[PDB]
């Protein structure tokens, strides 16, 4: 494989860096897997990434909203036609309500087609066997057989990735992204929800807006379909470097993209300034997210922003606040002020999930719904008060009727958790609770 | 002028009938005026009349609403670019609010381009001189000079008619019928109205529906312009018979239209079954209205419906209830039941104007706003209860800030009337009071 | 009537100038006619004039073509629904063929709604009576009764003007401007033309382009209707000054328009630099044409261009070459070179009509078809060679099957002329010969 | 896996049948591969198959054309982003020319995402090792190691299938299916082709039709993108039965689809009436093709049509004539007459490839371009003469500059073949020769 140009100087340097949360496995074998994946069809194409950069610039400048979400960890087992549908459906069903509430174009990103690699686990498990690190590295089975790290799982992940994107592209053009269809499903929610009497205000109001549209004779070019972009945490060195492709923009302008997804994002753990991922990200032309915890100082946030967005292109960087309901109001404002002052129009995104994960006195780990909302509530209160733009959210959900998060309209308590708990990692929002979340965030976008 | 076909047998018979409310003037002179007008360009064309019949069929079958209105009597003096604009603007500004409220296509008919002839006056005035009978017959001046009946005023009316339609067609294609522009004017009303705090519920709600439209990327083909159809009372024999033209529909299918307007309507006074107008109307292929008072018996309403709609074409006949706020609930239901049972899908239209005209203990004649609303309120209460469709309304308004009707948000009382009173005949709704009327009728269409 | 602003200084000065080709009539009476017409609805509105300026800028910059034409002189007698249709139809039927040939948007201007005033006649007739000077001044009858100059004919002209524009606006929205309909009529021409075997190349080719359009599933938003703008020679002082209106553009920017038409043009006779019309034209914000004969020197053409286009707004001025088939190649190139060099992007338009008018040894006056074509042929040869843009043409035609011009596919000779000759002034192209002209000009636009 | 309903009775019976051209491999292993593939995301979805049935009905009824084609056998090695692009590009580049020529919607089907299984080889090779039977069964390497039959290759094929469809869906929405872009590439062909002077007639003509489109202001909703459907020969029992899914149409109407592709087709070898494939095909709701050789008798063609299209749904069956240039005119007409008479509106498709395969006196096997054209030439001559509709073609091509077929504009002779020959099986058309084929078939569609 020959060199690009002046990137090779930078690329070699980028490999040199340490990478946290890597898998331990055979190197000679993993290099073969990579050189296989160096020639496959990509999951996405450069023009679609450009389209997302342009749409993400509008989010950065107050003209659009960002809905990101899906499974915490995709599993090969769960990557099926019925499950993918339900995630797409709930993502869209939310997006119609946020579109109305925000009075702006919602951009739909998804945790899909790549979100396999997982860091959150401690380095070793009880019983002396390695713990689950995603179906791209090892199996969920609690046996030394399955938990052994396997480079071949990278090809299985690429397979399952291209399967899922092929399906969302089909599902979206085939009209599960029909606007009238989605709102008819949202009435079925509000009618059959316990706390739907609260939300029926906005339900009727969206109903009216749609009937008004048809009354004005508005030709349904844009109403039959959507665009669901895709994303995952760029965790794994060999997989993400294998998906590097070299596109040539208009007038022969050459660039370097990671086409494993439209948008890649960096996690809390692999966040070092002189580590692989932040240097990888700054080299690739994709839009980029970056998770940010309470331990962030505004000094560091400006440092990230300078490296990841070195040309002040609005929407290139998303900064994903995940801080807990209590510490969001306190920590965030200083970060924004410093970042905005430095001349960077980033997308401010709320992740009210990975802040509020607590062990539920029941074996299982959960998040309380009321606390999840309260982090977003505070995320807006900071933006309203400072006079900056709430760019988006980054929730974790599923389209199955599962009981993993407490509270909500359903009244899910400690005792309800073992009844159905299908998640490979962090606890996801119930279908009921995902829609319910959107309606509340809509109300916050209005006021 | 040669004969059409089997129509000539019927046409001769139609002339034979007596016509009420005619002008007394020279016959030889008036026949020359007619034979001049027999060759001019028509005010409208057959294909547009067909378009209205098709759209009026949708009103008859519950799928659309009918907004009709404008000046009571157009005057040559008042037929000016600024006045016509303001009437068009308020007609459209209403139509956007009714469209939202009804959740259906509003069809916009106007009292314009022909509404000159006037019957309401008693046959002779005080002082022994003839009274005003519209600028198509005589002048407003109180002198035996001006009040003399003049056949030449028919050509002056045709001139002023083609002037006004030429302007609405231009105004509508030029973008005074822009949907975003109209609602921006409606916010200026609700902000600057006294009782706008009541209406700001629906104002924000329409605002949201429009921002939602732009958020969904909806291409503005249908949003920049409208269609304002035109109408007048077919009062005058010589003028309406001069505008008879013979069109040939698809596959050479020949028909006879009165192209003085898109839709002609019959008044309370010239309503006889064996009089000129009802026989004229049944011969012409235009859509047709018919005014109906408290003295109507359901027996007669079915007789009209049989003659005017002899082929059960839905939307061909409109039946215009004008009965007073008190007698609307009582008289109407029996008429609908009999008409619906006879197998006629007419358009049920409310005229809350020509029922409630009372002399205002001030010289001038007025209508009270609260009473006008209450006739429409009852018009809906009858339809809601019977389970039939409220097809439309037929208000009289102007786009000038005039004080002719009492009540409203403005608090217009007896003493306010002489301050500005520009109407040639019946008292019209203030700009403020026309918009205010629409918002209330919207609220009635929802519930 | 109060003053505009700094225009009044200029307006007074503009009146002061002598005006050629005026009518002699009562001044006190003509001032009443003018003060009547000062308050009527205009024939057009400012936003439509702005739209034309923007579209005419595209013609000036090589991106569009200009089709102007219609009757030489409209007559009140001829201003009828059937005649107007046929002129509109042939104007559009031409425009589809020119659109294809030019591979650009054709802009459709018409000699309609105002083209009554006529200058071409000598000042006095034989028999001592005044000669015909258009239905806006006097009648066609050869009697001292009718030929007397009548200010009231200005109001009759305004009436007939608003009649005709009301009809074209209706005819155009009602779908006589349907693109598939027009080409089906053009096949009927080519099939039934004698020389149609020459033109059937381009006929099939346009047929293919339309079927291709429907094959590509192209939504028919733009295909059902057109925009026919309107024009006349601004000849008559009192009529054109009566139609002056004051519009306020975006952000309250005030301007002065003559809304008797969209585009006014100046004739050969009333062309003086310090005469009324050139000073009138430079004061009004309308787009402007100017007729130009062989006697023009490039020195003068630059002088006109400086006065009429004082801000170098492209498309504001059209320069209408009418020079004869022989003298077009010789006279024109020097005019273009000087005008282009001076920094003026005007529209170069060919008028192959008013150059080639000769008395036909038969009483009547005619133009030979082959000579008419040859002036356009040379008009293109000049532009092809110089490398400038042929902006448009300015033919005179009618949609009746009349025999006024010699030659063509029909083989019209001297003896054929009295069979049907309906023109009030210059000889117009036959329906057959108008379409035939377009096909040839299309072939010239390709090569 | 539970039963559908009354299908299970029929499904069991369908398995019972013998299947020709199957692979010999471990059954227990191959059943695991199948039960894995029973739960994956499908390559396509039911609504898209319905869309194709509706579009294929229009082809059957003379309103549309069918362009099918691509690689003869896809190889995992060749299934790459650059190769897939070039095939898509040439498929579309052809489709624009056929769309114009046919004056109808071309429907674009592709040999992609599944076309791995191959029957054409004799049962055993020289050297005693098994011969190549497609990357879904074994490898191209000439070693007993690689040629061993491997059930795991079914999962590798599904992986590579979902990879490729994910890419065409992306490539098509991203604007490699832009109509103006494709024709700009077609001018580069005609300019740089040797025999392009023949084709420049239609090249300019398509250029004109596109400029005309932009001149008419036609909004580019439909012009930026296309729909490329997908197909392969349903050869392999375990793979096709694994992709059976159960969809529920509008109003809960249940059906059974094979979602390995949009359209499956049956080969010459596996064509028996009581064999697996014809009974499989008749059970699945997909549209269906069927290859047909010279040995077909009209008696049999009606028998097929009765079984495969048991409800006379037009466009459900495609009948693919592959007969050789000589025997096409002779054999075909009798088949059509009998089929049309039986009341079946099938799609008549020409496969001018698998008839004319001859060994090229050079080791390699080839087809002559002039002979390939002549089979289509005769295919049309039969339809023109009989007065039936030429529904489509089924060529085999690639977007690489390869030398596998003789003749064409390039002048490829025997000596040119080894220079570049990349095909795993039958010889494909050069990029130059694929475009050139389309232009000629366009000319045949006109006359
Ligand atoms: N195409 C528009 C409108 C739309 C269609 N389906 C949607 C579903 C959700 C939100 C918006 C939409 C958009 O993507 O915004
Ligand atoms: N053209 C649509 C929408 C529209 C445009 N302008 C309007 C003004 C009022 C109501 C609706 C409209 C209609 O006539 O209904
Ligand atoms: N609306 C487009 C296309 C069109 C419709 N009717 C036409 C008649 C002639 C030429 C073009 C057209 C235009 O005005 O150009
Ligand atoms: N969308 C239309 C037009 C079109 C777009 N791209 C194309 C490429 C080829 C042929 C047609 C098209 C179609 O599929 O037919
Ligand atoms: Mn998580
Ligand atoms: Mn009245
Ligand atoms: Mn002339
Ligand atoms: Mn083959």
- C contact residues 211-240, partner D, Cβ 8 Å cutoff: 211-213, 215-219, 221-223
- Residue A363, C-beta contacts closer than 8 angstroms, at least 6 positions apart: none
Q: Report yes or no: D319 and D268 within 8 Å, Cβ to Cβ.
A: no
Which ligand sits nearest to residue C427's alpha carbon?
Answer: 7
Minimal-distance CA residue to ligand 1 atom 10: A96
* Residue B130 phi, psi (nearest 5): -70, 145
In 3D, which of D444, D298, D446 has the Cα closest to residue D380? Answer: D444
Strands (E), C168-316: 231-233, 244-249, 253-258, 263-266, 288-292
Q: Strand ranges (DSSP E) for A294-356? A: 317-321, 347-350
* Cβ atoms of A396 and A433 closer than 8 Å: no
Dist. CA A397–CA A374, nearest whole Å? 17
* Nearest-10 Cα torsion for B327, B330, B336, B341: -150
Q: How close A83 comes to chain D (CA, Å)?
A: 10
CA–CA distance, A57 with A242 (Å, rounded to integer): 28
Contact D23, D149 (CB under 8 A): yes
Residues flagged as binding site of C for phosphoenolpyruvate = 111, 268-269, 291, 322
**For residue A396, what are the β-bridge partners?**
A70
Element (H, E) at A5: none
Closest CA to B318 of B279, B342, B298, B344: B344
Do residues A202 and A190 make contact, with C-beta atoms less than 8 angstroms apart? no
| Residue among B179, B213, B227 to mutate when testing ligand 2 (max atoms within 8 A of CB) | B179
3-state secondary structure chain D: CCCCCCHHHHHHHHHHCCCCCCCCCCHHHHHHHHHHHCCCCCCCCHHHHHHHHHHHHHHHCCCCEEEEEECCCCCCCCCCHHHHHHHHHHHHHHHHHHHHHHCCCEEECCECCCCCCCCCCCCCCHHHCCCCCCCCCCCCCCCHHHHCCCCCHHHHHHHHHHHHHHHHHHHHHCCCCCHHHHHHHHHHHHHHCCCHHHHHHHHHHHHHHHHHHHHCCCCCCCCCCCCECCEEECCCHHHHHHCEEEEEEHHHEEEEEECCCCEEEECCCCCCCCCHHHHHHHHCCCCEEEEECCCCCHHHHHHHHHHHCCCCCCCCEEEEECCCCCCHHHHHHHHHHHHHHCCCCCEEEECCCCCCCEEEEECEEECEHHHHHHHHHHHHHHHHHHCCCEEEEEEEECCCCCCCCEECCCCECHHHHHHCCCCCCCCCECHHHHHHHHHHHHHHHHC
Q: How far is the CA of D324 from the centre of ligand 8 (A)?
A: 14
Report helix, strand or coil for B389: coil
Q: Are A185 and A250 in contact (CB under 8 A)?
A: no
Contact D79 A159 (CB under 8 A): no
Burial grade of C311 (CB within 10 A; 0-12, 13-18, 19 or more): exposed
Give φ, ψ of A45 to 5 degrees: -130, 155
- Nearest-CA residue for atom 3 of ligand 1: B216
Contact at CB, D169 and A173, closer than 8 angstroms: yes
Dist. CA C240–CA C264, nearest whole Å: 9
Distance of alpha carbon D393 from alpha carbon D54, whole angstroms: 19
Q: Is D172 exposed, middle or buried (0-12, 13-18, 19+ CB in 10 A)?
A: buried
Resolution in Å, one decimal place: 2.7
Q: A105 in ligand 1 pocket by Cβ < 6 Å?
A: yes
Residues 6+ apart with CB under 8 A from B63: B104, B105
Q: Phi first, then psi: give them for residue C256, nearest 5 degrees.
A: -120, 120
Q: For residue B413, how many other CB atoms are within 10 A of its CB?
A: 12
Vertex C242 angle, CA C240 and C243, to 5°: 70
The residue whose CA is least distant from atom 2 of ligand 4 is C216
Nearest CA in chain B to C113: B166
D384 is in an annotated binding site: no
Most B CBs within 10 A among C78, C85, C170, hence the mutation to make, goes to C170
Using an 8 Å CB-CB cutoff, list chain C residues near D219.
219, 221-222
Tally DSSP H helices, then E strands, for chain C.
14, 12
> Could you give the angle at the alpha carbon of A218 between the alpha carbons of A213 and A224, nearest 5°?
85
Q: Under an 8 A CB cutoff, do B245 and C81 touch?
A: yes
Inter-chain contact C169–B171, Cβ cutoff 8 Å? no
CA distance C444 to D10: 69
Residue nearest to atom 14 of ligand 4 (CA): D226
Distance in Å from the first CA to the final CA of chain D: 55
Tell whether A268 is in a known binding site.
Answer: yes
Q: Which of D102, D212, D221 is opposite residue C209, by nearest beta carbon?
A: D212
Residue D394 bridge partners (DSSP): D68
- Binding-face residues of A in 161-180 toward B, CB within 8 A: 179
Chain C residue nearest residue B220, CA to CA = C221
Distance B177 CA to ligand 2 centre (A): 7
Residue D162 makes CB contacts below 8 A (sequence gap 6+) with A159, A162, A163, A166, D41, D43, D113
Give, for ligand 3, the residue of C103, C225, C228 to mutate: max count of ligand atoms closer than 8 Å to Cβ: C225
The CA C117 to ligand 8 mean position distance, Å, reads: 76
Which residues, in sequence order, are bridge partners of residue B255? B247
Q: Are B307 and B273 in contact (CB under 8 A)?
A: yes
Contacts of D415 (CB under 8 A, 6+ apart): none
In terms of Cβ atoms closer than 10 Å to its own Cβ (0-12, 13-18, 19+), residue C69 is buried
Q: CA of B217: which chain A residue's CA is closest?
A: A222
C-alpha span between D378 and D370 (Å, rounded): 12
In chain B, residues with a C-beta closer than 8 Å to the C-beta of C174 are 45, 47-48, 51
State how far Cα D338 lies from the chain centre.
Answer: 25
User: How was it solved?
Assistant: X-ray
Mention every residue, 6+ apart, whose C-beta is less than 8 A from residue A341. none
| CA–CA dist A385, A404 (Å, integer) | 33
Q: Which residues contact A391 (CB under 8 A, 6 or more apart)?
A: A59, A60, A65, A66, A318, A346, A347, A348, A349
Inter-chain contacts counted by CB atoms under 8 A, chains A and C = 3
D64, D96, D97: which to mutate for ligand 4, most atoms within 8 A of CB?
Answer: D96
What letter does residue C143 receive in the DSSP assignment? S
Using CA atoms, how far apart are residues A298 and D136, in angstroms rounded to an integer?
56
Please name the residues in contact with A282: beta carbons below 8 A apart, sequence gap of 6 or more.
A307, A308, A310
Give every CB contact of residue C347 below 8 A, 6+ residues apart in sequence: C56, C59, C60, C66, C315, C317, C318, C319, C391, C392
Nearest CA to C291 out of C10, C21, C17 is that of C21
- Decide whether any atom of ligand 3 lies within 6 Å of the C102 Cβ: no
Q: Write down the number of H helices and E strands in chain B.
A: 14, 12
Q: Is residue D96 in contact with ligand 4, taking CB distance under 6 Å?
A: yes
The residues, ordered by sequence, that sit 6+ positions from B111 with a Cβ below 8 Å of its Cβ are B68, B69, B70, B71, B72, B74, B231, B232, B396
Does the beta-carbon distance from A80 to D39 stay under 8 Å?
Answer: yes
Is residue B356 within 8 Å of B350, Cβ to Cβ? no
Total H helices, total E strands in chain A: 14, 12
End-to-end CA distance of chain A: 55
Query: Rounded to an integer, what distance in angstroms lies between the CA atom of residue A135 and that of residue A424?
Result: 10
Distance CA C299, CA C296 (A): 8
Backbone angles phi, psi at A266, to 5 degrees: -100, 140
Nearest to C224 by CA among C181, C260, C193, C190: C181
Residues flanking ion ligand 5, Cβ below 5 Å: A 72, 426
Q: Closest-CA residue in chain D for B221?
A: D219
């Amino acid at each position: 494989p020959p060199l690009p140009e002046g990137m090779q100087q930078q690329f070699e340097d980028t490999i040199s860096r340490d990478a946290k949360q890597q898998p331990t496995w055979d190197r000679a074998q993993a290099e073969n897997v990579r050189k296989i994946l160096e020639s496959v069809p990509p999951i996405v194409v450069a023009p679609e990434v450009l389209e997302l950069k342009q749409k993400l610039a509008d989010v950065a400048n107050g003209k659009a909203f960002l809905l990101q979400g899906g499974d915490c960890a995709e599993t090969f087992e769960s990557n099926t036609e019925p499950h993918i549908r339900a995630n797409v459906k709930t993502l869209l069903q939310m997006a119609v309500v946020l579109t109305y509430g925000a009075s702006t174009p919602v951009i739909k990103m998804a945790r899909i087609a790549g979100q396999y690699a997982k860091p959150r686990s401690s380095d070793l498990d009880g019983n002396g066997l390695p713990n689950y690190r995603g179906d791209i590295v090892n199996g969920v089975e609690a046996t030394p057989e399955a938990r052994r790290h396997d480079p071949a799982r990278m090809i299985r992940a690429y397979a399952n990735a291209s399967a899922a994107m092929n399906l969302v592209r089909a599902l979206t053009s085939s009209g599960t992204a029909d606007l009238y269809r989605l709102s008819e499903w949202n009435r079925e929610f509000v009618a059959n929800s316990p706390a739907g009497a609260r939300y029926e205000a906005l339900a009727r109001e969206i109903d009216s807006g749609l009937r008004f549209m048809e009354a004005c004779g508005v030709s349904d070019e844009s109403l039959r379909a959507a665009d669901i972009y895709c994303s995952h945490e760029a965790l794994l060195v060999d997989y993400e470097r294998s998906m590097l492709r070299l596109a040539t923009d208009e007038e022969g302008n050459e660039e370097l993209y990671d086409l494993s997804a439209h948008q890649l994002w960096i996690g809390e753990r692999t966040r070092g300034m002189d580590d692989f991922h932040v240097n990888f990200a700054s080299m690739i032309s994709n839009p980029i997210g970056i998770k940010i915890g309470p331990g962030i100082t505004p000094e560091e946030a400006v440092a990230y922003a300078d490296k990841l967005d070195p040309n002040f292109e609005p929407g290139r960087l998303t900064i994903v606040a995940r801080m807990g309901h209590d510490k969001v109001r306190s920590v965030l404002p200083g970060v924004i002020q410093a970042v905005e002052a430095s001349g960077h129009k980033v997308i401010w995104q709320s992740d009210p999930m990975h802040g509020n994960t607590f062990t539920a006195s029941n074996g299982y780990k959960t998040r309380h719904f009321d606390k999840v909302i309260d982090e977003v509530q505070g995320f807006f209160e900071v933006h309203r008060a400072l006079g900056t733009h709430p760019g988006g959210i980054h929730i974790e959900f599923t389209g199955e009727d599962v009981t993993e998060c407490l509270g909500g309209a359903e009244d899910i308590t400690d005792v309800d958790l073992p009844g159905r708990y299908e998640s490979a990692c962090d606890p996801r929002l119930n279908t009921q609770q995902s829609l319910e979340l959107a309606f509340l965030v809509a109300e916050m976008l209005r006021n």
